[PDB]
Amino acid sequence: PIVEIHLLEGYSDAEKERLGRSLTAAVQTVVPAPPEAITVMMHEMQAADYMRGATRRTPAPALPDAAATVRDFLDTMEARDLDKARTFLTDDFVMTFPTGRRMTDLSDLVEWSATRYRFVTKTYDRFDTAATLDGPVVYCFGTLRGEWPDGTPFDNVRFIDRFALRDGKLAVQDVWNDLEAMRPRG
Amino acid sequence: PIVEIHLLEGYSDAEKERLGRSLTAAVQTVVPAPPEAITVMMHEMQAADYMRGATRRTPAPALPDAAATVRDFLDTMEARDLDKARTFLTDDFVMTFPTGRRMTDLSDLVEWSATRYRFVTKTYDRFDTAATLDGPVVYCFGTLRGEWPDGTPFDNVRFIDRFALRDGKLAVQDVWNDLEAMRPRG
Amino acid sequence: PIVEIHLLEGYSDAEKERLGRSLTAAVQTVVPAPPEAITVMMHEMQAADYMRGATRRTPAPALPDAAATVRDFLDTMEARDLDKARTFLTDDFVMTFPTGRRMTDLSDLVEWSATRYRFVTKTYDRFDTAATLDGPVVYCFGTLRGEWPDGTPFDNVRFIDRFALRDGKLAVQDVWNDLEAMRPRG
Amino acid sequence: PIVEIHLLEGYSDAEKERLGRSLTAAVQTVVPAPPEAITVMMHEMQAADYMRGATRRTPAPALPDAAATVRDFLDTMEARDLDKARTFLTDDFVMTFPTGRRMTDLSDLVEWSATRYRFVTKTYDRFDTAATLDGPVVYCFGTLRGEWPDGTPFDNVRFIDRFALRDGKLAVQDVWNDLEAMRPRG
Amino acid sequence: PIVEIHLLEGYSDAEKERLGRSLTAAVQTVVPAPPEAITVMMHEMQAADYMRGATRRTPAPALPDAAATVRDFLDTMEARDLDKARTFLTDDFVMTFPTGRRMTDLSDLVEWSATRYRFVTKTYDRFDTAATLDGPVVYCFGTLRGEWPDGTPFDNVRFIDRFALRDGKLAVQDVWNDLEAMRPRG
Amino acid sequence: PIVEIHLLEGYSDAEKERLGRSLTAAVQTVVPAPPEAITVMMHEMQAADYMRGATRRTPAPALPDAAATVRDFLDTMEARDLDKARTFLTDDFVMTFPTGRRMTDLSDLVEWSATRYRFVTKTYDRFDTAATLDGPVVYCFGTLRGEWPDGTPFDNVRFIDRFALRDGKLAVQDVWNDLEAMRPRG
């Protein structure tokens, strides 16, 4: 198939590359063509050349790459810089962790997790973005290395995180992992 | 923005609705417009009206809704009908469950899980589809109700599954959940 | 220039001819091309092939030719069939006649005009439609034949009417003419 | 609906705004959509990118806003600057005034109207442009203030003018008003 | 590259295949892409959906495949059916043969060639069509088998013909060949 | 008809003029419209605005005008500059001349033709280009002036050449002419 999209000028070459990959993948959820067979053409318009409601329109500035926002937030959390982490978040951000623990304060999380392990470090196997009609949703998964509270090291403990965004800011985090499954029981 | 897509005749009204929603969401990963502002127009062509390589082309039949394939497979598994379940799968299907247990045989899974709970039943909170350039990827999550092996009932145990597909068939399953986190320890 | 327009199926061949003439004339208010040089192409879409807001849309049924509505109302008024005339009108229809007389009741008009002439009959020289962003506006003009109240005949008395419409119904009438200019003064 | 128009480069942002409003209104004479629902996209082409008859074409320079030409001519006439007024006119310009008086010379008009009032000054309620296939046609109307020949002042006397243009110049004027209707009769 | 063409309904699937191959080859005279990379999409319009000069237009019926017309004429000439051959021709058809002999009458040709060989039979190596802006031009070439006037057989004598057409009928024929080069000289 | 073509930026105004004439003529092999009725519009895209296979693509640099390449080679051959002539040619270039003589070496040709005439000079009546799906093919024809080996002059001897190209270089030459037909026989 061939996809054309009409948009106002002002998007970067990198924003366009994202949009083009995104449209190409959307086609592949219905049409089992290889990416190589799918064309995306973008038609950029000056403000004077576009009109809706008999008025000119001003383009909404692009959203940031949601997957990179998510990675940057989780990197900031591993560096323990909470002041910076809170800048990625909506005022009503909610996280849910294993056991169903629901928290709204990043410091509540740190208290809670101290009892569960000394530290943990994420290795990422993959980021997937799920385009929805309420904006993008980010899934990332891979493995954890760390130490149980007695200093015993572990590695390779599967994890997965899900983030919902709102106007580029993180609004909901959900977390699932294999920690309780691999924890030693004496 | 306005999206046009050119495709050969032969897709159903329902396949088109999927493709149109999918393209609309793709736009929203970069352009923070509301769905209401985004138009998708589909231009359908008879075979005589399309030519690539100076030849007519024959359309690849649509892929099934991946999320519905996934739901149907997991429903079949809850009914214990393995013969039917295997028809959803590629010959090299691989599942990975908590602890990192890797299995290729649906009967291996049933043996293994019998030791972990009497039964479990999924309530779905959400299906998300992640369009990628290797085809769609399905994420679903919600909660489990069941009984521990001693007959003790539990409900509301968070879970998440991830499926990768290949030409409409399920090729990779990954599973993460809160069972070991909620299991009673005596 | 070349004009394309994308619309949902359901318009008649005659509604399309109106729309095509209308778009062709719009171009000529800025570009001094002859009609012969201007192309209009209409792209008709089945409901399954169009999507805004990730939903299908249902086309608003065409407006009637405003100039013909206006002619039909004025013909009905010349036949004195007020019951039928009132069906062309909005509930708040207002007419303004020479001297600035403002009336909302068709019977008020008949009372008033009886003192001004025995009868009058319109010959139309032209109908012009003014496309605006509040819908079409109709101008028609030509001459009147009739009799002054003493039975003296006149012909060829210039007149002009202006109508504003609202959802196909007549909402405002304004009238200007040469009657008082040609009336005999003894 | 969605309207695309293909045109050669060289039109101003203001000429485009006129053309876009004009096309938007044309749609509304048939399709009862609100302006807000109607999109106009203009595709501008360099000369090297357009070909008709296997040759490049040179764009006809835009027509001036006909309504503004008309206003400027009538303002010049109120200032009594006939030398400048004649520059707006075709060589065969014809005016028709109440009683059907037909004149081709602006000085003939001034002679004639001196007997009818001392002076008159237009207040404009509205300009409407009627796109036709012989070019734009301008209608304007509102009220007159002035003095009858005995110095008696009047205000609020309804008037309407109609202009036909030809290649940007005024070619036909028609006038209708309430003066004879409001003139005092002693 | 991607080529779209807009045309009125009424062309056959075979006329479209010709037009699509023809447009694909035109691209390849400038852009060194393989045919496989070049897409042609044809947009067919009902009469009600197309307008030029504010009127509907009626499509000119397709031209026949010029190469097949040429082959059919030359086959008819080999069968000696002149009555049928003349139906392929314009009233002013002109042929030019080796030595520059110019003839307008098919019977003149037969007289002339009788002195040159007993008979000759064409084997075609290729037909090429040259799209020009005065319509298509056909070139065909291959070899001749026959007998010199003394009954001596020859084969494999190179030839080439060129035809210019006019509204589907043959208007000019030019011929060049190796006969005089291979004729035996005693 | 109306033709649009979508291409990457980087073609000259002259390459576009060729492509536009070429597409216009292609239409005329099926649709008997005059060139004046046929529109070609070229849509040029920046690399950031085009994507196939979810990657940006780099345009293949234009082919040179094949007819001009052919003329330049034949002009170089008339000047006897073989070193320069060989630069127009593929490594496997093959020429076939009257009698079917097949040669791969430009010096072989010069030896052979010395026995046939003192010299010859081409006057061109026409170049035609035949767009095919293996690239352009060039036909040129007109007349020869020269001298037979005894110094006797001739003029006006019809000739025709055909060239097949490959990636802009000449790959096959075929030649047919009236020399043996006009040679004097004593």
DSSP H helices in chain A: 13-28, 66-78, 82-85, 106-114, 179-182
Residue B77 and residue B158 in one domain: yes
Q: Which residues of D114-139 are buried (b: 16+ CB within 10 A; e: fewer)?
A: eeebeebebeeeebbbbbbeebbbbb
Integer Cα distance of F99 and F115 in angstroms: 14
Q: Does residue D149 contact residue D118 with C-beta atoms inside 8 Å?
A: yes
- Which DSSP symbol is given to F48? G
Q: Where are the beta strands (DSSP E) in chain E?
A: 2-8, 39-45, 50-52, 89-97, 101-103, 119-132, 135-147, 153-166, 169-177
Residue E81 and residue E113 in one domain: yes
Q: Where are the beta strands (DSSP E) in D19-134?
A: 39-45, 50-52, 89-97, 101-103, 119-132
Integer Cα distance of C34 and C38 in angstroms: 7
Integer Cα distance of A147 and A153 in angstroms: 4
Cβ contacts of C62 on chain D, cutoff 8 Å: 30-32
Cβ contacts of A183 on chain B, cutoff 8 Å: 180
Residue F113 and residue F149 in one domain: yes
Cβ contacts of E48 on chain C, cutoff 8 Å: 13, 16-17, 42
The count of structural domains within chain C is 2
Show the CA angle centred on residue E171, arms to residues E167 and E176, nearest 5°: 135
User: Inter-chain contact B51–E17, Cβ cutoff 8 Å?
Assistant: yes
Q: Does residue C134 contact residue D126 with C-beta atoms inside 8 Å?
A: no
User: Does residue A42 form part of some domain?
Assistant: yes
Q: In terms of residue numbers, what domain contains F19?
A: 2-49
Q: β-strand B153-166 against B135-147: which pairing, if any?
A: antiparallel
- Which DSSP symbol is given to B62? P
* Tally of CB atoms within 10 A around C78: 13
Choose from F6, F43, F51 for mutation: most chain A CBs within 10 A.
F51
Integer Cα distance of D155 and D149 in angstroms: 14
Q: β-strand F169-177 against F89-97: which pairing, if any?
A: parallel
Residue B86 and residue B15 in one domain: no
3-state secondary structure of B91: strand
Burial class (CB in 10 A: 0-12, 13-18, 19+), C39: buried
Reported for E143-152, long-range contacts at CB under 8 A and 24+ positions apart, including other chains, are E144/E120, E144/E177, E144/E179, E145/E120, E145/E121, E146/E117, E146/E118, E146/E119, E146/E120, E146/E121, E147/E117, E147/E118, E147/E119, E148/E117, E148/E118, E148/E183, E148/E184, E149/E115, E149/E116, E149/E117, E149/E118, E151/E118, E152/E184
Cβ contacts of C36 on chain E, cutoff 8 Å: 52-53
User: Inter-chain contact F185–E185, Cβ cutoff 8 Å?
Assistant: yes
- CA separation (Å) from D90 to B97, C24, C127, D86, D97? 88, 25, 24, 8, 18
3-state secondary structure of D115: coil
Integer Cα distance of A41 and A16 in angstroms: 10
Integer Cα distance of E183 and E153 in angstroms: 11
Q: Output the six-digit token pair for E19.
A: 């037009």
Integer Cα distance of F27 and D28 in angstroms: 36
Q: Output the six-digit token pair for A151.
A: 């200093």
User: Inter-chain contact C39–E54, Cβ cutoff 8 Å?
Assistant: no
Q: Output the six-digit token pair for C183.
A: 């009336």
Q: Which of D6, D48, D54 sits opposite F24 (nearest CB)?
A: D54
Residue E71 and residue E154 in one domain: yes
Choose from C2, C36, C38 for mutation: most chain F CBs within 10 A.
C2
User: Inter-chain contact C135–D98, Cβ cutoff 8 Å?
Assistant: no
Q: Which chain B residue is nearest to residue E14, measuring alpha carbons?
A: B48
| Phi and psi based region of residue D167 (left: phi greater than 0; alpha: psi -120 to 50; beta: remaining) | left
Helix (H) or strand (E) holding E16: helix E13-28
- CA separation (Å) from E88 to E85, E91, E103, E106, E127? 6, 10, 16, 12, 18
* Tally of CB atoms within 10 A around F29: 27
User: Does residue A147 form part of some domain?
Assistant: yes
How near does any CA of chain C get to the CA of E56, in Å? 8
Per DSSP, the residues of C113-177 read HHTT-SEEEEEEEEEEEEEEBTEEEEEEEEEEEEE-TTS-EEEEEEEEEEEEEETTEEEEEEEEE
Helix (H) or strand (E) holding C185: none
User: Does residue D114 form part of some domain?
Assistant: yes
Half-sphere exposure of C109 (CA within 13 A, CB side): 22
Residues 6+ apart with CB under 8 A from C114: none
- Which DSSP symbol is given to D127? E
Is residue A20 within 8 angstroms of chain F, CB to CB?
A: yes
Half-sphere exposure of E133 (CA within 13 A, CB side): 15
User: Does residue B154 form part of some domain?
Assistant: yes
E13-28 vs F13-28: helix crossing angle, rounded to 10 = 160
Integer Cα distance of D127 and D161 in angstroms: 10
Tell me the sheet residues that pair with A53.
Answer: none
Is residue C41 within 8 angstroms of chain F, CB to CB?
A: yes
Is residue D7 within 8 angstroms of chain F, CB to CB?
A: no
Nearest to C119 by CA among C147, C82, C151, C157: C147
Neighbours, chain E (3 or more CB pairs < 8 A): A, B, C, F
User: Inter-chain contact D39–A49, Cβ cutoff 8 Å?
Assistant: no
The residue type of F177 is N
Q: What are phi and psi of A171, to 5 degrees?
A: -115, -30
The residue type of D124 is Y
Q: Which of F6, F49, F54 sits opposite A16 (nearest CB)?
A: F49
The residue type of E29 is T
Q: Which of A18, A29, A98 sits opposite B136 (nearest CB)?
A: A29
Residue B174 and residue B117 in one domain: yes
Strand ranges across the sheet with A153-166: A101-103, A89-97, A169-177, A153-166, A135-147, A119-132
Residue F26 and residue F94 in one domain: no
Size of chain E in residues: 186
Integer Cα distance of F22 and E3 in angstroms: 13
Q: Output the six-digit token pair for F90.
A: 């593929």
Residue F104 and residue F176 in one domain: yes
Q: β-strand B2-8 against A2-8: which pairing, if any?
A: antiparallel
User: Inter-chain contact C63–D6, Cβ cutoff 8 Å?
Assistant: no
User: Does residue D141 form part of some domain?
Assistant: yes
- Which DSSP symbol is given to D87? G
User: Inter-chain contact B62–A30, Cβ cutoff 8 Å?
Assistant: yes
Cβ contacts of C37 on chain F, cutoff 8 Å: none
Integer Cα distance of D162 and D173 in angstroms: 6
Residue F35 and residue F7 in one domain: yes
Integer Cα distance of F101 and C88 in angstroms: 89
List the resolution, Å: 2.3
Is residue B57 within 8 angstroms of chain E, CB to CB?
A: no
CATH classification of the domain holding E150: 3.10.450.50
Is residue E114 within 8 angstroms of chain A, CB to CB?
A: no
Integer Cα distance of A37 and A28 in angstroms: 10
Residue D45 and residue D70 in one domain: no
Residues 6+ apart with CB under 8 A from C160: C139, C140, C141, C175, C176, C177, D160, D162, D174, D176
Choose from D30, D39, D70, D140 for mutation: most chain C CBs within 10 A.
D30
Helix (H) or strand (E) holding B7: strand B2-8
User: Does residue F110 form part of some domain?
Assistant: yes
* Tally of CB atoms within 10 A around D167: 10
Residue appearing with tokens 């046609």: D137
User: Does residue A60 form part of some domain?
Assistant: no
CATH classification of the domain holding C21: 3.30.429.10
Residue A150 and residue A75 in one domain: yes
Burial class (CB in 10 A: 0-12, 13-18, 19+), C102: exposed
User: Inter-chain contact F51–A24, Cβ cutoff 8 Å?
Assistant: yes
The 3-class SS string of E83-136 reads: HHHHHHEEEEEEEEECCCEEECCHHHHHHHHHCCCCEEEEEEEEEEEEEEECEE
Residues 6+ apart with CB under 8 A from D14: none
Q: Which chain B residue is nearest to residue D40, measuring alpha carbons?
A: B2
CA gyration radius, chain C: 21
Integer Cα distance of E155 and E122 in angstroms: 10
Residue appearing with tokens 């609705």: B17
Tell me the sheet residues that pair with C162.
Answer: C139, C174
Residue appearing with tokens 């003149």: E108
Residue C170 and residue C101 in one domain: yes
How near does any CA of chain A get to the CA of E43, in Å? 14
Choose from C4, C46, C52, C57 for mutation: most chain B CBs within 10 A.
C52
Integer Cα distance of B22 and A28 in angstroms: 10
Residue appearing with tokens 């030029």: E52
Integer Cα distance of F124 and F93 in angstroms: 23
Is residue C49 within 8 angstroms of chain B, CB to CB?
A: yes
Is residue D128 within 8 angstroms of chain A, CB to CB?
A: no
* Tally of CB atoms within 10 A around F159: 21
Integer Cα distance of C32 and C38 in angstroms: 10
Q: Output the six-digit token pair for D13.
A: 């942002």
Integer Cα distance of B50 and C20 in angstroms: 27
- CA separation (Å) from D50 to B139, D7, D55, D105, E150? 49, 9, 8, 45, 62
Integer Cα distance of F126 and F131 in angstroms: 16
Q: Output the six-digit token pair for E132.
A: 């020009």
- CA separation (Å) from A157 to A121, A144, C25, C43? 10, 5, 71, 56
Residues 6+ apart with CB under 8 A from C184: C148, C152
